[PDB]
Write an enzyme that holds these catalytic residues in place. Sequence first.
Site, PDB file in Angstrom:
ATOM      1  N   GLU A  35     -17.524 -34.344  -0.799  1.00  0.00           N
ATOM      2  CA  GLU A  35     -17.506 -34.665   0.432  1.00  0.00           C
ATOM      3  C   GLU A  35     -16.404 -35.395   0.775  1.00  0.00           C
ATOM      4  OE1 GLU A  35     -18.768 -33.018   2.813  1.00  0.00           O
ATOM      5  OE2 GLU A  35     -20.391 -32.298   2.410  1.00  0.00           O
ATOM      6  N   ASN A  46     -11.683 -29.604  11.497  1.00  0.00           N
ATOM      7  CA  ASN A  46     -12.332 -28.739  10.730  1.00  0.00           C
ATOM      8  C   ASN A  46     -12.201 -27.964  12.194  1.00  0.00           C
ATOM      9  OD1 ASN A  46     -15.733 -30.741  11.349  1.00  0.00           O
ATOM     10  ND2 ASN A  46     -14.774 -29.774   9.390  1.00  0.00           N
ATOM     11  N   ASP A  48     -12.851 -26.152  14.516  1.00  0.00           N
ATOM     12  CA  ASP A  48     -13.534 -26.071  15.700  1.00  0.00           C
ATOM     13  C   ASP A  48     -13.077 -27.442  16.367  1.00  0.00           C
ATOM     14  OD1 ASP A  48     -15.089 -28.156  14.804  1.00  0.00           O
ATOM     15  OD2 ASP A  48     -16.988 -27.905  15.874  1.00  0.00           O
ATOM     16  N   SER A  50     -13.395 -30.503  15.700  1.00  0.00           N
ATOM     17  CA  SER A  50     -14.045 -31.995  15.342  1.00  0.00           C
ATOM     18  C   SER A  50     -13.549 -32.253  13.979  1.00  0.00           C
ATOM     19  CB  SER A  50     -15.865 -31.512  15.226  1.00  0.00           C
ATOM     20  OG  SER A  50     -15.672 -30.473  13.772  1.00  0.00           O
ATOM     21  N   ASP A  52     -14.815 -34.661  10.319  1.00  0.00           N
ATOM     22  CA  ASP A  52     -15.221 -35.216   9.463  1.00  0.00           C
ATOM     23  C   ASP A  52     -14.617 -36.671   8.702  1.00  0.00           C
ATOM     24  OD1 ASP A  52     -17.166 -32.715   9.484  1.00  0.00           O
ATOM     25  OD2 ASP A  52     -16.694 -32.004   7.575  1.00  0.00           O
ATOM     26  N   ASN A  59     -19.575 -35.793  11.129  1.00  0.00           N
ATOM     27  CA  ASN A  59     -19.052 -34.451  11.714  1.00  0.00           C
ATOM     28  C   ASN A  59     -18.997 -35.014  13.522  1.00  0.00           C
ATOM     29  OD1 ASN A  59     -18.893 -32.189  13.379  1.00  0.00           O
ATOM     30  ND2 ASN A  59     -17.371 -32.511  11.646  1.00  0.00           N
TER      31      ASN A  59
END
EC number: 3.2.1.17
Length: 129
Positions: A35, A46, A48, A50, A52, A59
């Site tokens: 990650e 991301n 969309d 959002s 992380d 998220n």
Amino acid sequence: KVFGRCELAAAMKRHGLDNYRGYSLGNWVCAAKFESNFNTQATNRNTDGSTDYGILQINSRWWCNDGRTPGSRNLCNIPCSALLSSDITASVNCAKKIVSDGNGMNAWVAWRNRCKGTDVQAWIRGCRL
Ligand SMILES: [Cl-]
Ligand SMILES: [Cl-]
Ligand SMILES: [Cl-]
Ligand SMILES: [Cl-]
Ligand SMILES: [Cl-]
Ligand SMILES: [Cl-]
Ligand SMILES: [Cl-]
Ligand SMILES: [Cl-]
Ligand code: NA
């Protein structure tokens, strides 16, 4: 902060993540490796909208507030910036909620794709724990 492998394993164990919800410590270290490469300051947008955050790339759509993810929730009740601290407490406490949400560590797509079913004990091998 960029943790060493065994250093992060020890911090995760101290914060109660070892065998949390049945997931051994190596599963957690493996997920953090892919990650964030063990970097607490990692962020990634991301598609969309959002973002992380942190060692476990938690998220903003569900878990933390960053003020710019429309329609999102803050189920860990924390600012996303708290997930970038050198102190991993906030990331660990929020990850405990995420892994309890129903699908286990499959919530982390990278864990499913790169850690699940592998020899995850290799990630803590040699460490004084
Ligand atoms: Cl490593
Ligand atoms: Cl363990
Ligand atoms: Cl393990
Ligand atoms: Cl928001
Ligand atoms: Cl909320
Ligand atoms: Cl906030
Ligand atoms: Cl820590
Ligand atoms: Cl599970
Ligand atoms: Na949010």
